[PDB]
Design goal:
The complex is a heterodimer of chains A (218) and B (220). By secondary structure, chain A is mainly beta. In chain B, the strands form 4 sheets. In chain B, strands 2, 4, 5, 6, 9, 10 and 11 form a 7-stranded mixed sheet that branches. In chain B, strands 12, 13, 15, 16 and 17 form a 5-stranded antiparallel sheet that branches. In chain B, strand 18 and strand 19 form a beta hairpin. Chain B is 0% helix and 50% strand. Chain B has no helices and 19 strands. The chains are: A mainly beta (218), B mainly beta (220). At the A-B interface, strand 5, strand 10, strand 12, helix 1 and strand 13 of A face strand 5, strand 9, strand 12, strand 13 and strand 17 of B. It is classed as immune system.
Chain lengths: 218, 220
């Protein structure tokens, strides 16, 4: 099997500048017919892959002019003349010389922007869920940057780690922020033994924890 | 107008069988070589199989892990390609895409939208949908509402707000799986001058179970 390597898992870039992504193959991709079989694909969050460049440097139809490709033998480069916020996604190279066809692990493009504090919202269990015997407490931490954030749940001042469900969105293609959802799963009975519920978040935009809480008895 | 459309995915029993279809239009299907590529966490994109055109004897090529279990075929009169999968294993779970090389040296130029295949012995279960409304009073300029979708299987569910009329301030998070099955949440942020004056409704559809639910977000 031909091994395709894209060393960088991600590359941070600011809109307006040029950048390049590299890919290497364990064997020359030059065919006897004279063509080099290396293609580049883009996979935007939640969508199917799309061809950007075929055979090293030919731009596919509909692909923006800011993309270009170069390389030969076993080293290739995809370049952006000017990056746009909307270029967020994962970029893959693929060899189309021998079977099985193999893809690189991909390089995610990360758009750099100004710090942005998360907007934190906490939601007590809806009454419809309580009549059903469940009590999920939901906390949304939206539109923040940089991407790393830490969430802590406290039930009557004591921390809780079990029964926490965490989910993260990919970088937004318009404002370049990230969002996260954290859900504390409790049974109605557990929910009623306590009164204070707090969603505590730690982010670079604040020296002190971002706290949001409510009291069941209200 | 070029397109490839897959169909036939969904939940299937380990050791069971499933046939995927791919319908093409907008390009010269009879000249194209057609391939199936799948995606899963850990392997990322993985080439699966290929069938060549009539001129090239309709030859088929398969990746090692599916040889003997999968069969690819095509019907040029219906502009379609099929992928018959047998003895399915948990490792075959993933999104399957149909793609084609329309002409020499063009690469995988056209891709379908993908179809999710989940190999598991668990059973199809509809979701329960719960509106999430703020506690206190707005203000301040914007208000965030949510929708909790839980207890369903398998993926996916589609969540829209006001039948799609609300989309800019929307975040639908990836689902999380544990003993209560899948749990997914979606939030929407709107001007405080929009809610609760205007109706805000979460619409949920779960294709696998044919469930459809519309729940209104009411001030608590
Ligand atoms: O995919 C096609 O051929 C193949 C030949 C070999 C094996 C992979 C790659 N090299 C590809 C290529 O583009 O060369 C093709 C599609 C339509 C019409 C004719 C040929």
């Amino acid at each position: 099997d031909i091994v395709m390597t894209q060393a960088a898992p991600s590359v941070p870039v600011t809109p307006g500048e040029s950048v390049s992504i590299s890919c290497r193959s364990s064997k020359s991709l030059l065919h006897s017919n004279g063509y080099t079989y290396l293609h580049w694909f883009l996979q935007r969050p939640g969508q199917s892959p799309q061809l950007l460049i075929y055979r090293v440097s030919n731009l596919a139809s509909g692909v923006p002019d800011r993309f270009s490709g170069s390389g030969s033998g076993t080293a290739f480069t995809l370049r952006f003349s000017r990056v746009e916020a909307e270029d967020v996604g994962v970029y893959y190279c693929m060899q189309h010389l021998e079977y099985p066809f193999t893809f690189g692990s991909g390089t995610k493009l990360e758009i750099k922007r100004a710090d942005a504090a998360p907007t934190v919202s906490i939601f007590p269990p809806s009454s419809e869920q309580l009549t059903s015997g469940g009590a999920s407490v939901v906390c949304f931490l939206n539109n923040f940057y940089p991407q790393d954030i830490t969430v802590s749940w406290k039930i009557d001042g004591a921390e809780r780690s079990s029964g926490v469900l965490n989910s993260w969105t990919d970088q937004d293609s318009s404002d370049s922020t990230y969002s996260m959802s954290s859900t504390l799963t409790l049974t109605k009975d557990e929910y009623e033994r306590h009164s204070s519920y707090t969603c505590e978040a730690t982010h670079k935009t604040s020296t002190s924890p971002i706290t949001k809480s409510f009291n069941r008895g209200e | 107008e070029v397109t490839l459309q897959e169909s036939g995915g969904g939940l299937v029993q380990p050791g069971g069988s499933m046939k995927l279809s791919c319908a093409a239009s907008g390009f010269t299907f009879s000249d194209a070589w057609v391939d199936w590529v799948r995606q899963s966490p850990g392997k990322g994109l993985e080439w699966v199989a290929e069938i060549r055109n009539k001129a090239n004897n309709h030859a088929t090529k398969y990746t090692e892990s599916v040889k003997g279990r999968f069969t690819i075929s095509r019907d040029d009169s219906k502009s379609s390609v099929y992928l018959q999968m047998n003895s399915l294993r948990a490792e075959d779970t993933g999104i399957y895409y149909c793609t084609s090389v329309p002409q020499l040296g063009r690469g995988f130029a056209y891709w379908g939208q993908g179809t999710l295949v989940t190999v598991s012995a668990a059973s199809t279960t509809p979701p329960s949908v719960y509106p999430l409304a703020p506690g206190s009073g707005g203000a301040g300029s914007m208000v965030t509402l949510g929708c909790l979708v839980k207890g369903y299987f398998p993926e996916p569910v589609t969540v829209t707000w006001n039948s799609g009329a609300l989309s800019s301030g929307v975040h639908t998070f990836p689902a999380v799986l544990q003993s209560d099955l899948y749990t997914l949440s979606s939030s929407v942020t709107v001007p405080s001058s929009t809610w609760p004056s205007q109706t805000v409704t979460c619409n949920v559809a779960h294709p696998a179970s044919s469930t459809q639910v519309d729940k209104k977000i009411v001030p608590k």
